[PDB]
Design a protein around this ligand. Structure first.
Ligand SMILES: O=C(O)c1ccc(-c2nn(C(=O)c3c(Cl)cccc3Cl)c3ccc(Cl)cc23)c(OCc2ccccc2)c1
Ligand SMILES: O=C(O)c1ccc(-c2nn(C(=O)c3c(Cl)cccc3Cl)c3ccc(Cl)cc23)c(OCc2ccccc2)c1
Lengths: 259, 265
């Protein structure tokens, strides 16, 4: 449908907007995680006392961490929404469909971009100023410990693809413009956009990872991992809500999960 | 891989697909469209009674429950078990498969058959019903969907998937490679040696990509769209398992001869 130079033009547009919309890119996250730098070193939270000193440097503990995750997730939804509006064609769609695409897309994107902040040992927090260990997260009390770990399980697998931000920008766009979301009114204009986004992703991956055979297909197979984990996540929230009333969700998240 | 080798792999898989499965999509479509020998139509109780009397569909004959919705439900189980052997035979023709670790062969088949059965079920389905007994019968969607509370809602999601999947208008040469790709999934739990499985899937994906470009040149990004269907397949298979457990925990008019239970477990 589109010519090669237009596909490169679209990749560059989406990368540029991705940089403008998201505060902490994978490039910066990797520089902090690998280290070698004295200025970008995070403070590491691995236990209670280090959590106590960290809140000085940058309610029950598992709740406080959980609320920390909701708060950043809500911020992520805002950033994702701002990015979505820059995807060519998105704002021109029926307004109910705009809501529907975001409703079902934000969680799959949050998981994707969370991986950029992760390695096998923990996750960056507070715009990269802190690093909270995986083992500490998994050791939180009964419901919450195992609520944290699946995010890491996805991230190590997804990060083995070695995508960079310019790849992720198009991949994220492809997720949003999914015509198979429930309740869409005009699937066809959404698929026309995804077709160009898919063409753009395909060419991008061929040029940026010429040695990574069938990375396109392998990356699309990860969209399978994203559906299931989002589903598990929702089922865990419902269970936690049924026990914890010292918890309450941001109305933005509340609406997303309803029906 | 070179272009002609991918065509060789496509043709190998197409030939094997034809020999392994009883009723192809091409022939199933001829029956459903009404082109073809009209199949016997099961649209209610009395027509089921006459079909099992006149044609004697072997998955739909007495054995143990007299209740019809249970009998149809079990008939789907019985045919699924036949298909497993057909899929298993097809798997052995996939280049490289028999050379894998034997436990991995079992693991891949174990975790793949559900996704493949759903996929191939669509070939026998349209929006109005499903072919049975190698195309000799046609059971209507309305009759299946109207079976009493648990069983009606167990049948309908299969049609809903099939209708969406059939809109891709894949033919048998497409499906043969697609089924192969499902089998060679390296993320199945308990695999011992993932690398040779992904190596094979990589070849199969290349062949599927080229096949779809040549067979559907007008169908932009059909490759990507078909891989996105593997999302639908994963989800529906998980739902299906959750649906069975509820039936097992509620229905106790379901007991068969213990040997039958072992076979059709
Ligand atoms: O910076 C970011 O882009 C971003 C995006 C997502 C999360 C995150 N969300 N999350 C959920 O459970 C969740 C999700 Cl996926 C979606 C909606 C609501 C919720 Cl509540 C997590 C569970 C475990 C972990 Cl390790 C992280 C998350 C995130 O955590 C940073 C964090 C970690 C520890 C303490 C404080 C802050 C950062
Ligand atoms: O000939 C075939 O290729 C083939 C493949 C799959 C099915 C089938 N399986 N099935 C499951 O629930 C199921 C599945 Cl998808 C996967 C694994 C196990 C199970 Cl148990 C069905 C549910 C509803 C319907 Cl309408 C059909 C199926 C099949 O039914 C033929 C049939 C229909 C009605 C009465 C008796 C027999 C034929």
């Amino acid at each position: 449908h589109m010519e090669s130079a237009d596909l490169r033009a679209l990749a560059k547009h989406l990368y540029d907007s991705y940089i403008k919309s998201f505060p902490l890119t994978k490039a910066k996250a990797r520089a902090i995680l690998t280290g070698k730098t004295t200025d970008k070193s995070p403070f590491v939270i691995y236990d209670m006392n280090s959590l106590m000193m960290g809140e000085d440097k940058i309610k029950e503990v598992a709740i406080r961490i959980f609320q920390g995750c909701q708060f950043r997730s809500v911020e992520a939804v805002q950033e994702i929404t701002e990015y979505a509006k820059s995807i060519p064609g998105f704002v021109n769609l029926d307004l109910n469909d705009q809501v529907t695409l975001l409703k079902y897309g934000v969680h799959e994107i949050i998981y994707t971009m969370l991986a950029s902040l992760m390695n096998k040992d923990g996750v960056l927090i507070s715009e990269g100023q802190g690093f909270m260990t995986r083992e500490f997260l998994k050791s939180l009390r009964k419901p919450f410990g195992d609520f944290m770990e699946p995010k890491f399980e996805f991230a190590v697998k997804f990060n083995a693809l070695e995508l960079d931000d310019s790849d992720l920008a198009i991949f994220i766009a492809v997720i949003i413009l999914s015509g198979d979301r429930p309740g869409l009114l005009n699937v066809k204009p959404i698929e026309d956009i995804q077709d160009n986004l898919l063409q753009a992703l395909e060419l991008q991956l061929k040029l940026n990872h010429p040695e990574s055979s069938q990375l396109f297909a392998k990356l699309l197979q990860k969209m399978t991992d994203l559906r299931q984990i989002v589903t598990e996540h929702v089922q865990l929230l419902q269970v936690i809500k049924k026990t914890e009333t010292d918890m309450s969700l941001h109305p933005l998240l509340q609406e997303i999960y309803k029906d």
